[PDB]
């Protein structure tokens, strides 16, 4: 019906399905793990169940497991029940994959695909002392309460602020001074990964469900310190990881237009369905379910990263070690 | 050392600390100033999310490094 497959939910893992579904239409990202060597201990590698699961998304006909994959990270049964946030597995599942990827074929994919480089600018207000902070990032935070859209969010994330009071700077043999901290960007990622702050603490973990609106194409040059007039940082939305219920728990889905061509599906576990641009983005622009998550792909990169992705980028080690698994 | 603390406002808050101090240790000055409590503050830097049980030193965080508070939207 739609092209594409769905994962099975084990039982709360929603946030896996949706994050893998995520990695998977990454294409040059699921190109890279396709060739990690696994030729590494059967269900205790990471790799090796992210090439099974990506392999069978990718030609199986019925819903795909990830049985192997969370016994891969060392878990029992009973943590396949427990709800988790989608950003904070993205950050363990990337971090772990990057670090295996070193010394391999593909050393450096996960920081060419997702990290960038923020700088943050201090300048005393009553004293000649400045300094420099330049530190790598592979998602960006963006404040949600307050604010109409992603644009002035990214307005606000840039704005100039008062390192004031009990916030004073650390400014040397001058000791506590006021301040003014800045922060702009240096580079943007090819794939760039958005958590909206849907959250603010009756002494209770709160979501926000208040509107916010994102676009399809976002333009990011006002938040670089250099444009380079050659590569525009214009970016094609991707993805929507949806959560709908409460800080407690909920549920998520994913929705994405795999081909950065603007037709889009919805995945909710074992269904994926065909939708409009408009279920994908105004509908969950919120205002219980909106977004949580969002990826945008860099405009100069979509042909590369969203490349067409065959049997051809499948070694056909991992294909017998695959199949040769009953 | 003092490095920054990105809060769940987007707010940024100096927050003073030692190379030796483990994650805990953060997780409860940051509660001592945002009040947040550590059991439910995640806190990324340079796209990991430190670990309860490492140090500050452990990730080359040095003076004037921001770390990025959220929470935890679960599903």
Redo the contacts between chains.
Sequence with gaps: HTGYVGLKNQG?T??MNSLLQTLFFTNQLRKAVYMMPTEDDSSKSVPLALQRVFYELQHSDKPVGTKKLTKSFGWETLDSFM??????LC??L??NVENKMKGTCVEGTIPKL??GK?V?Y?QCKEVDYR???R?????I?L?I?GKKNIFESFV??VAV?Q?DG?????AGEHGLQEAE?GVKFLTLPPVLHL?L?????T?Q?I?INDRFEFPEQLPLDEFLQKTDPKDPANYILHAVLV???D??????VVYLNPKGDGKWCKFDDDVVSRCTKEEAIEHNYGGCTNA?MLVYIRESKLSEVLQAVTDHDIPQQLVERLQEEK | ??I?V?T???????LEVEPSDTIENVKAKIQD?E???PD?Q?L??????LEDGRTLSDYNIQ????L?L??????
Excluded: W
Aim: hydrophobic share 25%; charged share 30%.
């Design positions: 709360a929603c946030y709800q988790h946030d989608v950003q904070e950050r363990v990337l971090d997702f990290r923020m943050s201090i300094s420099d902070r530190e790598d990032y592979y998602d935070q404040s309460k606000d994330y602020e390192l009990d916030n004073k700077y650390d901290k958590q702050m849907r959250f603010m603490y002494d973990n979501k959560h709908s219920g800080n407690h728990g909920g549920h998520y949580y | 050392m003092q920054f990105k769940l406002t987007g707010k940024t808050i100096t100033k009040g947040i409590p439910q995640r990324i830097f340079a796209g990991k999310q003076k004037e490094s921001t990025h959220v929470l935890r939207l679960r599903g």
